[PDB]
């Protein structure tokens, strides 16, 4: 079986804690590894980064959206919101009626709420495939 651990042991992904992160130079995206030569008034200006003559990168983020957690991953386009609103959604999505489990009918709990007709969202983030949000909306 070739999975994640084989990548880690083949020397293409490694783990870093906060203290080791002090000593490393992380490229933000795989494209940042090379300087581009654009002018798109619509796409956001990727930062100039002009002060440093030659970058010596040691690491790259797998994807920048992974900094968010479980609750923040439901938000669509969180980079177009002021941050307090992202926090409020992280709080309120935990209070949202859905289907907590598929065996809710053979369980006996103090309280349970089930939505009649759950729908998956029309605008979706890649992360919700791993959170089962499209399976239990």
């Amino acid at each position: 079986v070739y999975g994640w651990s084989s990548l880690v042991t083949s020397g293409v992904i490694e783990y870093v804690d906060g203290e080791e992160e002090e000593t490393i130079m992380i490229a933000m995206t795989p494209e940042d590894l090379q300087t581009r030569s654009l002018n798109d008034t619509a796409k956001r200006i990727k930062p100039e980064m002009s002060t440093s003559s030659h970058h010596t990168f040691t690491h790259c983020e797998i994807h920048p959206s992974m900094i968010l957690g479980v609750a923040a991953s439901i938000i669509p386009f969180p980079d177009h919101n002021q941050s307090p609103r992202n926090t409020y959604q992280s709080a309120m999505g935990k209070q949202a009626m859905g289907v907590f489990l598929t065996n809710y009918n053979v369980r006996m709990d103090t309280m349970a709420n089930i939505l009649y007709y759950p729908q998956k969202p029309l605008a979706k983030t890649q992360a919700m495939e791993y959170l089962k949000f499209r399976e239990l909306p």
């Binding site: 998956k120 399976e135 909306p137």
Partner: protein, 66 residues
């Protein structure tokens, strides 16, 4: 859970189209074309069928209790 009988927004009957929609998706037609053939023209009716999640299949796997 199971496909709603009506469209929430306007009230068109969509409960008789889920099986035809699944059969159309089996033979390769993409979702927009299948929704076109079922004659769902308003995007409310279309999102009724396109966003449905069928949970009754998961609920039916737990043994009848009588």
């Amino acid at each position: 859970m199971i496909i709603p009988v009506r469209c929430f927004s306007c009230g068109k009957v969509v409960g008789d189209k889920w099986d035809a929609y699944l059969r159309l998706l089996e033979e390769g037609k993409q979702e927009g074309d299948a929704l076109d053939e079922l004659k769902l023209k308003r995007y409310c009716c279309r999102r009724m069928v396109l966003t449905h999640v069928d949970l009754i299949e998961k609920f039916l796997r737990y043994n009848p209790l009588e």
